[PDB]
Write a protein that binds this ligand. Structure first.
Ligand SMILES: O=C(CCCC[C@@H]1SC[C@@H]2NC(=O)N[C@@H]21)NCCN(Cc1ccccn1)Cc1ccccn1
Ligand SMILES: O=C(CCCC[C@@H]1SC[C@@H]2NC(=O)N[C@@H]21)NCCN(Cc1ccccn1)Cc1ccccn1
Ligand SMILES: O=C(CCCC[C@@H]1SC[C@@H]2NC(=O)N[C@@H]21)NCCN(Cc1ccccn1)Cc1ccccn1
Ligand SMILES: O=C(CCCC[C@@H]1SC[C@@H]2NC(=O)N[C@@H]21)NCCN(Cc1ccccn1)Cc1ccccn1
Ligand SMILES: [Cu+2]
Ligand SMILES: [Cu+2]
Ligand SMILES: [Cu+2]
Ligand SMILES: [Cu+2]
Ligand SMILES: [Cu+2]
Ligand SMILES: [Cu+2]
Ligand SMILES: [Cu+2]
Ligand SMILES: [Cu+2]
Ligand SMILES: [Cu+2]
Ligand SMILES: [Cu+2]
Ligand SMILES: [Cu+2]
Ligand SMILES: [Cu+2]
Lengths: 124, 124, 124, 124
């Protein structure tokens, strides 16, 4: 992976959540997520994918991952996906948008999905 | 997994894309995705998560998954995440919204992400 | 407006909501919206814009509009924007995605915005 | 309008775009938008709505607006809607998410809509 070492590690977003990830040579993302907000406590499993051979023209590295909000402590009957790009450098960043879908009845499905944006950095 | 057997299998969306998934007892989703549209050919690896203990009140089962659009044939320097819910029954469905992020330069990052919605069924 | 007459009128979405709109020659959209779901009763003012000189290559006509969910009956302290395209023909459609933002405290702002998709037709 | 005076004026986002708006007592937003990026030059008409009687519990004020990207100079056959909330104070802000839909053929409609997020301030 061209950015395998740049992506692997601990990241933090603007909410104070902690994203712990390992980037595999094959494009895999594996790790844990701890949300500072919402119906969440402690760590949750995450899995995702990244472009392991990104362009060399200065572009970011596309990636995404999922958390289902069930662990041994809580189950919020919901899943978030983050879709974004890694941008390397002295101030490396992962800039994302996300979709949080909750399980709902059919009558409430129109209101099942929140959208937002998180920026992750190696400090904070 | 309460819906492990309902989710595992081959699904098709309204574009004619093919989503092949296995739901594990631990909440994992693993499989392949073949898109009928865009800069894509043949199968791509996917990974994701689902709620393996959903509510029993008639609500759907939250889930999500990621594809990075690199395989042995092509690399579109992009990743899609689908966030949604599985709804079981004689006409089972997976209803999703998705975010497709491309690696971009910083100057083009404002236009990095497409959004849309796919519905998957067991027929088509 | 090339599609002024095609857009003006009463439309209905998959939820049973009623979208009453007038397209002006200058690109304006004006009318009322009645939602069949959520914290809403009776009609709300809407305003928006459309491309009054669309491409002639078979493409749809881009448009968007806003409703703030305050009227003489209720105030849900929220606003929805629909962004989409009009597609003319015997089965005319307006295909949209939407963002529903609620006023929140700063601590809850991460969960302020719902996303979804509505399809409007001239029948239903 | 409770925030009529707070909203009316000139705002700037993180891209350097200029949002000039008047908030009416009736909930209307009217003004012009100038984008620093994309297929845009000079000012475009905008219209939208805001909650003219927001909650008094510290919550933001919900609002939204639309620009169709046609003016006397250019027509990009597209429309953006911004959905967000105004947050008053010494560092007032309008925090938004947006959907940019382009007119497309049916075959390309899956890729018609970009999503992003802009923050507007009274300085910059
Ligand atoms: O809260 C969660 C799980 C944790 C999500 C944290 C998000 S992920 C994106 C963002 N980035 C982060 O680092 N943290 C946050 N899921 C339900 C969200 N519900 C609302 C909500 C908001 C705040 C508090 C409680 N509920 C929805 C709901 C739908 C139906 C019934 C009930 N509730
Ligand atoms: O096309 C892909 C990969 C395949 C995506 C298929 C999607 S996933 C959601 C939806 N559901 C499906 O089953 N299929 C589709 N990624 C790039 C999208 N580009 C546009 C695009 C659209 C159509 C054709 C070519 N390009 C973006 C781009 C950003 C910068 C430079 C260049 N291109
Ligand atoms: O319900 C509304 C106004 C009507 C929206 C109808 C939408 S517009 C898109 C879609 N298309 C339609 O035709 N109808 C619907 N706004 C608040 C949404 N709240 C959830 C909600 C969902 C269901 C019932 C009550 N609340 C949010 C909330 C955030 C904080 C506190 C409290 N509530
Ligand atoms: O560029 C525009 C109009 C200006 C949008 C500025 C946005 S609004 C949200 C954000 N906030 C701002 O202040 N500025 C920006 N519309 C087309 C976007 N196209 C891509 C694009 C991106 C960059 C340059 C040219 N094209 C799409 C396209 C779809 C089919 C064919 C062709 N093109
Ligand atoms: Cu909740
Ligand atoms: Cu390349
Ligand atoms: Cu972003
Ligand atoms: Cu492309
Ligand atoms: Cu439960
Ligand atoms: Cu949907
Ligand atoms: Cu509500
Ligand atoms: Cu043209
Ligand atoms: Cu759509
Ligand atoms: Cu363009
Ligand atoms: Cu109130
Ligand atoms: Cu935001």
């Amino acid at each position: 992976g061209r950015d395998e070492a740049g992506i692997t590690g601990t990241w933090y977003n603007q909410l104070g959540s902690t994203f712990i990830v390992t980037a595999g040579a094959d494009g895999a993302l594996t790790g844990t997520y701890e949300s500072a907000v919402g119906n969440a406590e402690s760590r949750y499993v995450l899995t995702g994918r990244y472009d392991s051979a990104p362009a060399t023209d200065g572009s970011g590295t596309a990636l995404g991952w999922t958390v289902a909000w069930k662990n041994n402590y809580r189950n919020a009957h919901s899943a978030t996906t983050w879709s974004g790009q890694y941008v390397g450098g002295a101030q490396a960043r992962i800039n994302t948008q996300w979709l949080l879908t909750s399980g709902t009845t059919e009558a409430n499905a129109w209101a099942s999905t929140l959208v937002g944006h998180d920026t992750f950095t190696k400090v904070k």
